């Protein structure tokens, strides 16, 4: 153990941090610990270990505020810091959040971008800091993002497959799932969805906000197309109905007009999450808040704004005197928000920038994890000086084919074939007239086989022939043509892989990422645990 740390702490020393420019180790203070004034209230963690998810339901339609729930864990890193926030910097808090916030209706700890990422870059088990946040955590209800088809891989998956990432996690500590698709397709989320309620968790069913429902030149997303998705996912069995708005699209007017027409559409709780790239964010909460709301998804100051959620002590002082209130401690809120910003203080070489209210997200549509990655894709073949003109070509594309929703991984097919479209120098035309010849990206080939699922309306039907030349094109569930997987055997592959027996969480982790399981493994022999040092040392040694 001392030798893989002194080993791990020689590497960073002399050949500095992958990924990042090699720089000397600043000397930084000790973060500021909150000074709480404690209250013991009954948390919505405790209804759900007592009572159930119903009860917790019935315990947010039975709340006249409106409740929070913290993204700082998940959200807030993953679109300001690259998702590279470490479990040792959220281990410091996560005491403090738990006692000092037990007003929060959950925290958004884990699924997205964390459970790749935190393998990948911060060589650290996502289990793990899932078992470390729930034993300091044991009154705070977890939420995940979890996608209905892939869990938080992206190959294609069989159900089995699911149903037991489900029933690890929900074992494990996750009490909240947040199933959404990408494309908003029912069957992808059907089976999520009867997997969490069966292992007795909650179950969030999630509506993707994409175009403007009172825009009437676009009517393919219109008030009807929400009502009859969340009539749909009410029928599923859904605890709470989610609205996602990942490239925070969401107008406050539409907003108010969204959430009235789903409440008289639907009896769920209706939860909504958005984020703060136009800067509309506070006020589309308010405007989801006199239209009567239940939940929403906010961040901590320090993490908020931006790419990020609204601030939670900003969405606080909103609503201070309305007929609404938000319901939290603000001041130990913002106890908790000076830790926040003196650990993120040690993720500058993971900082995007500076950083402005941008509303020509309302014209390209891109989420930030999207544009970040199109915008670094753009710089690595020497076409980042024409961004404008591939944000143009983005929103084209996205017309062209049939105006989807574009989160992961849909909104990488529109980015793909946006800057293929631009290397090569295409048009509308140009693809339609020559687009036998081309071969386009294996994600826009892959969209459009049928392999991400169906988007509403169908595909267009000549782009789909020119895209996809002789390959087969399902119609159903890619889960259902997913190659059988038997967890006997992949436990005793990999058994012979790494030097024990694995457990069934990493089972579940090597089925989801085969190789960047086996690379954290590789690491872990090498370096060891390497998650237990502190931020600066971890990056500079
Ligand atoms: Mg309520
Ligand atoms: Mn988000």
């Known amino acids: 153990r001392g030798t893989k740390t002194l080993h791990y702490l020689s590497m960073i020393t002399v050949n500095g941090f992958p990924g990042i420019e090699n720089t000397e180790k600043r000397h930084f203070e000790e973060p500021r610990q909150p000074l709480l004034n404690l209250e013991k209230k009954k948390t919505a963690k405790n209804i759900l270990d007592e009572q159930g998810a119903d009860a917790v339901v019935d315990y947010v339609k039975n709340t006249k505020e409106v409740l929070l729930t913290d993204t700082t864990l998940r959200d807030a890193h993953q679109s300001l810091l690259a998702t590279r926030l470490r479990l040792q910097d959220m281990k410091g808090i996560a005491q403090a959040i738990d006692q000092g916030l037990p007003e929060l ?19 650290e088990s996502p289990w793990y800091r899932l078992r470390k946040l729930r034993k300091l955590m044991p009154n705070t209800m977890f939420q995940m993002l979890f996608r209905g088809s892939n869990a938080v891989g992206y190959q294609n998956y069989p159900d089995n497959v699911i149903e037991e990432f489900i029933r690890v996690a929900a074992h494990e500590g996750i009490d909240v799932f947040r199933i959404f698709d990408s494309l908003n397709w029912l069957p992808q989320m059907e089976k999520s969805i009867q997997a969490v309620r069966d292992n007795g968790k909650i179950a969030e069913a999630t509506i993707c906000y994409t175009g ?32 996602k708005d990942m490239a925070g699209l969401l107008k406050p007017q539409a907003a108010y ?107 390209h549509e891109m989420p930030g994890g999207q544009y970040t990655n199109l915008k670094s894709q753009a710089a ?99 889960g259902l043509h997913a190659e059988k997987v038997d967890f006997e055997t992949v436990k005793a592959d990999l058994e ?36 237990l040092l502190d931020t600066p040392t971890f990056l500079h040694g």
């Open 257 to 363: 007009r969204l959430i009235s027409e789903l409440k008289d559409t639907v009896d769920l709780p209706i939860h909504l999450h958005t984020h703060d790239t136009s800067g509309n964010g506070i006020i589309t909460y308010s405007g989801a808040t006199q239209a009567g709301v239940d939940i929403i998804d906010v961040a901590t100051a320090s993490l908020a704004g931006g790419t990020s959620q609204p601030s939670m002590q900003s969405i606080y002082y909103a609503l201070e005197h309305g007929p609404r209130h938000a319901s939290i401690n603000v001041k130990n809120a913002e106890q908790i928000d000076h830790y926040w910003e003196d650990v993120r203080k040690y993720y500058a070489p993971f900082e995007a920038g500076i950083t402005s209210p941008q509303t020509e997200v309302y014209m």
């Open 105 to 123: 209706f959950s925290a958004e700890m884990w699924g997205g971008a964390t459970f790749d990422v935190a393998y990948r870059f911060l060589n």
């Open 496 to 531: 012979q892989k790494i030097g024990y027996e694995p457990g069934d969480h990493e089972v579940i982790s090597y089925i989801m990422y085969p190789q960047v399981f086996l690379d954290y493994q590789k690491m872990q022999r090498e370096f060891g645990a390497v998650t």
């Open 212 to 243: 403007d429902i009172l825009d009437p030149s676009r009517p393919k997303y219109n008030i009807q197309y929400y009502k009859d998705l969340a009539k749909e996912l009410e029928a599923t069995g859904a605890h709470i109905l989610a609205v």
């Open 380 to 478: 690595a073949v020497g076409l980042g000086h024409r961004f404008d003109e591939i944000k143009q070509m983005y929103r084209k594309v996205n017309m062209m084919f049939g105006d989807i929703i574009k989160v992961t991984p849909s909104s990488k097919v529109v980015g793909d074939m946006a800057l293929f479209m631009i290397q090569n120098d295409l048009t509308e035309e140009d693809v339609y007239a020559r687009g036998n010849e081309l071969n386009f990206p294996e994600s826009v080939v892959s969209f459009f086989r049928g392999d991400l699922g169906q988007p509403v309306g169908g595909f267009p039907e000549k782009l789909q022939k020119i895209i996809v030349k002789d390959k087969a094109v399902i119609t159903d569930r890619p």
